[model samples]
Target: NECVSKGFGCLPQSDCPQEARLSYGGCSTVCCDLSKLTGCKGKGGECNPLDRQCKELQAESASCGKGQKCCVWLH
Candidate 1:
């Protein structure tokens, strides 16, 4: 219906957040930035308050003090 396509333009779902839940009964018209950390699963209900949405990052030099390795997730 034309009523659903008004908020956000035509864009693929893959272009949206990996965690953006689908609209239950209506088509999702807008996308929300799910990249921000709302909080851990069950830890007294506090949020990280920092943006973790992957895009909000910069290259940084790290001096690996010890025998630790930086980890990145892969699909």
Candidate 2:
């Protein structure tokens, strides 16, 4: 999906629309953005199943498209 594949994630609506994090849609609860940094980096992530932990805390912390989560496992 766009959020994870495009290096995006659901950020607090108030935290987005910045230079790094571009907007995606009407996620008033949690808006989507690349958040290029330590916070959901625009470098792109993957759609992970929440059941799978170490959870990594990225997608679990925010939200991801397709009911999935994000991972920077660019680790």
Candidate 3:
């Protein structure tokens, strides 16, 4: 839940000391409050279930679109 409620999306592993997106049983891309205009390729961008990061929703409640779900990191 750190991703959301905070403008801290998954930084590029190549640019930071981080790991690539991984998965558990499965993965899915969902709509979320991505970081600033630069955080994601585009604001409100969709991310793989593994790279579940939505920074825009940080400090605010999430209101997903119809059929989309607001997701956050579980770690």
Candidate 4:
């Protein structure tokens, strides 16, 4: 997909406008580019199977918020 192929996992909604992650047998708008970083660079650190966004804990802990998550780790 665009997320993996592209170095940026967080395939901007523009790049993938309507995208979702394939799960055991489901999908979600909480899209992400795990191909870039492992933890979570944009929304959260972990990939969720639904809703597209990982379980929100706090804004301060968000991937893009704390520098602790990144696309590099995902790749």
Candidate closest to the true structure, highest TM-score: 2
lDDT of 3 by residue, 1-75 (tens): 444335444434343232333222122332233332234323444333423545434322333334443443433
lDDT of 1 by residue, 1-75 (tens): 431343322224665454653343244543433223221212222222233332111111021113322222232
TM-scores of all candidate predictions against the true structure: 0.20, 0.30, 0.19, 0.20
Q: Whose lDDT is greatest here?
A: 2
- The global C-alpha lDDT for each of the candidates, from Candidate 1 onward, is 0.29, 0.51, 0.35, 0.37
Q: Per-residue CA lDDT of candidate 4, range 8-70, in tens?
A: 443344533343332322223334545332334443344233334434444324444443322
Candidate 1 TM-score to native: 0.20
Which residues of candidate 1, in runs, are more than 4 Å off? Answer: 2-6, 24-75
Roughly what TM-score does model 3 have, to 2 decimal places? 0.19
By lDDT, rank the candidates, best first: 2, 4, 3, 1
lDDT of 4 at 37: 28
**Can you tell me which runs of candidate 3 are displaced by over 4 Å?**
12-14, 17-37, 46-75
Off by over 4 Å in 4: 1-25, 40-75
Residue-level lDDT of model 2, residues 6-35, one tens digit each, is: 545566656655554444544435545444
> Can you give the lDDT of residue 7 in candidate 1?
34
Worst 10 residues of 3 by lDDT: 22-31
